[PDB]
Structure 1
Amino acid sequence: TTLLNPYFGEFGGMYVPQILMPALNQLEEAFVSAQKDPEFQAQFADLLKNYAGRPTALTKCQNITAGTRTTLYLKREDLLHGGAHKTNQVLGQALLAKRMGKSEIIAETGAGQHGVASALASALLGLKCRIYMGAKDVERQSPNVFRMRLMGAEVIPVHSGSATLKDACNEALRDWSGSYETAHYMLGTAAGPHPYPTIVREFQRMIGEETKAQILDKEGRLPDAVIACVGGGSNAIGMFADFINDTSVGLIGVEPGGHGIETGEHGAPLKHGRVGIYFGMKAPMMQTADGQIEESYSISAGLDFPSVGPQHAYLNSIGRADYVSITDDEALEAFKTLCRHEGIIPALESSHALAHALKMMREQPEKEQLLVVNLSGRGDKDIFTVHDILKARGEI
């Protein structure tokens, strides 16, 4: 029994050990109550505006589109406090955690962006935060690890499995299953068991709401398409949500193609996996013929997850949203192009979305189209990854 529908068509649900159902039910109840509470909405809004820096700019890119009939705007979540869209929902989830009388926060992270966001919200709002991070990501992301620790968070390397995001996810949920009385699990994406896909969407939907208002003000019409990368689904559903009922607006999600779909080294379960049950949800998964969960791969540690949120799976199944993939090399080229031609260093995650937009422009350069890319974060965290790649490839 739930207050809200846990499914998006066939996808979603609450596939957790029985011990955790009361925690999920309490969270749902607290969320429904908070959404009707003008004091909660006012405090959330105040933090978003005066602490995180909303609204974020919508930037027209008048160098990268030269010579084509594409007009391209970037929604500048990279300018949010912390450097990415993750800060939106951590603020809301932290307020929910306090509303429920929880004093501790558990969070997973890949490249460290949700970790940094969880750490900063916990520091501001007086919560004790512990972050699980794949040991391979820890080794490669020592700067974001130190940032989390500077803000008072405990960072716990995870050495199991691939030692990446999926493994951090597993450990966080194991932890919560023995600490839910005092700890809120601050899940970092629009996935996992109900109510997380719904809560994360609602605490990220200001992205699309602002984008709609900004594009109407500047262009007098809606975009032809909005484009966002998809690792778990948070930034994409935050952009998509307010446009779902605007049937003329294309919704395009970009999964990581890694080394190429044909190599098996990618993170594109929505289009190249099949439905399974894992991480609390019924959703498309990368899995073996036997039903073991496969390890994903991407140059971008924030997209390195072998499943995807159920609402995206649903929006795809009905044809409302279209999903594509972008390889490591395509993302790298988009990263370099934005740095050099717009003076913006984008996250490698967001570079996947930009790469697809650039493809939409370059493939049909005389097609008149108004596109918005969700620039979900900044790429300062990625400069070492990019450097080592360009060094190994002889480019520098």
Structure 2
Amino acid sequence: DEILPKYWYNIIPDLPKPLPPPRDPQGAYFSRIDLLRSILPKEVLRQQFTIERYIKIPEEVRDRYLSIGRPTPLFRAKRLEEYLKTPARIYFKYEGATPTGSHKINTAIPQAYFAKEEGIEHVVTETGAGQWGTAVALAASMYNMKSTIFMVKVSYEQKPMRRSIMQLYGANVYASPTNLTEYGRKILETNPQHPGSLGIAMSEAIEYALKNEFRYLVGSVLDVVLLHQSVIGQETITQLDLLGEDADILIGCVGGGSNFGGFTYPFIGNKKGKRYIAVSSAEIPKFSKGEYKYDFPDSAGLLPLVKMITLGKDYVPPPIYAGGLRYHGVAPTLSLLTKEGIVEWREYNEREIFEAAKIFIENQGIVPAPESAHAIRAVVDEAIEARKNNERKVIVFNLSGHGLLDLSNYESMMKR
């Protein structure tokens, strides 16, 4: 059962081209790169810039990983193959198995460990849906630290269930834009009805941590996060090996890009598999309308400039969509890999992903996260192409979370 990796894998040393580094803005009044040393736990920052191919997972972190149910299951979806009358075999790494219901726990656990080891005793972060907020509240609870979550205001109101779990673990949850940070009140001044965005909530979390000498935990985009997530892809390889299977098509959904890069990068770096499909929302068209430029992860501009596919730091998501994947940019490594042609990208609209989920609910049984139904949707379309081609394609996809706390979302999608 030590299919659980001994190391995290960083793809950077194996990339086709160099990965442009984070960067202070031209003629900036303060150094963002220098500010990182206040924002991030020292060892998180060290892993973000001490780029090696492999990095030992501290044994205490491996122990915690095991205690939440790692390695996650690698299921075969045989009923689904039969329903699609496809000759392909369909497998999914089920990241919904962790207590929080998503893969985000994989980076919250080490980050929290490193902060507790450094003497931190209060962490802060943002969240949209609440998958990341819940991960961080559980991880903080594990290491006896307080947590403050800045939740995007509109999500705060439509998703009280996740708030309950975060508060249940011991977190305090505010609705960004709040008036607890300078950047919050600024946004309330100009439009006090503003429904928030991940970029705005990120900035208040960072501002709030600085103002109080807390630390900030980062849930996607940065390389240290996709490094931590590489437990997903490494287990999958080992688990496919146990089956004598070889992946052909690897599919993942993309918000900021951590579950995809955690899932596919061990495959890409070592030269396993062939065809990687990052799947995103048409209502947040990072890939179809985004722009590959240096830009801030957060909206205030408190983090360094980072080279990524982005709709723009001050992007505000569509008002009625309920499918997730609302963050405005893509991880720099993922952005590089897709611009360089190594990863394929695909966007789906809400109806398509909603139908995909019902297919999965009705022919596999797990209620998937709306996020993950983007991947399911591509899985289904590929299973059908393997049909009209007749080849035993093995499609492995990453089911990044369950949808049990997203039932209000599925109700909203009965409007299609």
Q: What's the TM-score once normalised by structure 1's chain length?
A: 0.85
Distance 1:130 1:91 in 2: 16
Aligned to 1:293: 314
Aligned to 1:263: none
Change (3 A) 1:296 1:382: same
Quote the offset at 1:203 in angstroms. Answer: 1.1
Amino acid across the alignment from 1:187: V
Aligned to 2:224: 199
Change (3 A) 1:30 1:10: closer
Q: Is contact 2:102–2:131 with CA below 8 Å preserved after alignment? A: yes
Does residue 146 in structure 1 map to residue 164 in structure 2? yes
**1:220-239 to 2 correspondence within 5 Å?**
220-239=244-263
Quote the offset at 1:315 in angstroms. Answer: 0.7
Distance 2:316 2:235 in 1: 36
Amino acid across the alignment from 1:274: E
Residues 212-233 of structure 1, C-alpha deviations (whole Å, 9 max, x = no match):
1111221x24200111000101
Amino acid across the alignment from 2:202: C
Q: Is contact 2:351–2:413 with CA below 8 Å preserved after alignment? A: no
Aligned to 1:163: 196
Distance 1:117 1:21 in 2: 22
**1:249-328 to 2 correspondence within 5 Å?**
249-257=274-282, 266-276=283-293, 277-279=295-297, 280=303, 281-287=306-312, 293-297=314-318, 299-300=321-322, 302-328=324-350
Distance 2:240 2:12 in 1: 32
User: In the alignment, which of 66, 84, 89 is matched to residue 107 of structure 2?
Assistant: 89
Aligned to 1:240: 264
Q: Is contact 2:292–2:335 with CA below 8 Å preserved after alignment? A: no
For residue 214 of structure 1, give the secondary structure of its aligned residue in structure 2: helix
Quote the offset at 1:272 in angstroms. Answer: 2.1
Does residue 186 in structure 1 map to residue 217 in structure 2? yes
What is the number of equivalent residue pairs in this alignment? 366
The worse-fitting range, judged by mean Cα deviation, of 170-179 and 75-84 is: 170-179
Distance 1:63 1:247 in 2: 26
Q: Is contact 2:41–2:115 with CA below 8 Å preserved after alignment? A: no
Structure 1: runs of 5+ lacking an equivalent:
192-196, 258-265
Quote the offset at 1:316 in angstroms. Answer: 1.0
Change (3 A) 1:13 1:387: same
Distance 2:412 2:347 in 1: 24
Distance 2:254 2:411 in 1: 24
Q: Is contact 1:132–1:168 with CA below 8 Å preserved after alignment? A: yes
For residue 92 of structure 2, give the secondary structure of its aligned residue in structure 1: strand
Aligned to 2:154: 136
For residue 65 of structure 1, give the secondary structure of its aligned residue in structure 2: helix
Aligned to 1:174: 207
Distance 1:114 1:333 in 2: 25
Aligned to 1:56: 72
Change (3 A) 1:62 1:105: same
Quote the offset at 1:101 in angstroms. Answer: 2.1
Aligned to 1:260: none
Aligned to 2:182: none
**1:40-51 to 2 correspondence within 5 Å?**
41-50=58-67
Does residue 385 in structure 1 map to residue 385 in structure 2? no
Q: Is contact 1:164–1:301 with CA below 8 Å preserved after alignment? A: no
Quote the offset at 1:12 in angstroms. Answer: 4.8
Distance 1:243 1:352 in 2: 20
Across the aligned residues of Structure 1 and Structure 2, the Cα RMSD in angstroms comes to: 2.7
Change (3 A) 1:299 1:12: farther
Amino acid across the alignment from 1:332: F
User: In the alignment, which of 134, 138, 147 is matched to residue 120 of structure 1?
Assistant: 138
Amino acid across the alignment from 1:315: L
Distance 1:183 1:25 in 2: 9
Q: Give the percent of matched residue pairs that are identical in Structure 1 and Structure 2.
A: 28
Quote the offset at 1:373 in angstroms. Answer: 1.1
Distance 2:117 2:236 in 1: 30
Quote the offset at 1:120 in angstroms. Answer: 0.7
Distance 1:346 1:303 in 2: 14
Structure 2: runs of 5+ lacking an equivalent:
1-10, 178-186, 188-193, 298-302
Does residue 73 in structure 1 map to residue 59 in structure 2? no
Quote the offset at 1:386 in angstroms. Answer: 0.9
Amino acid across the alignment from 1:304: R
Does residue 354 in structure 1 map to residue 387 in structure 2? no
Q: Is contact 1:273–1:284 with CA below 8 Å preserved after alignment? A: yes
Distance 2:41 2:107 in 1: 19
Distance 1:247 1:142 in 2: 42
Change (3 A) 1:376 1:5: closer
Does residue 22 in structure 1 map to residue 45 in structure 2? no
Quote the offset at 1:5 in angstroms. Answer: 7.9
Q: Is contact 1:12–1:310 with CA below 8 Å preserved after alignment? A: no
For residue 308 of structure 1, give the secondary structure of its aligned residue in structure 2: coil
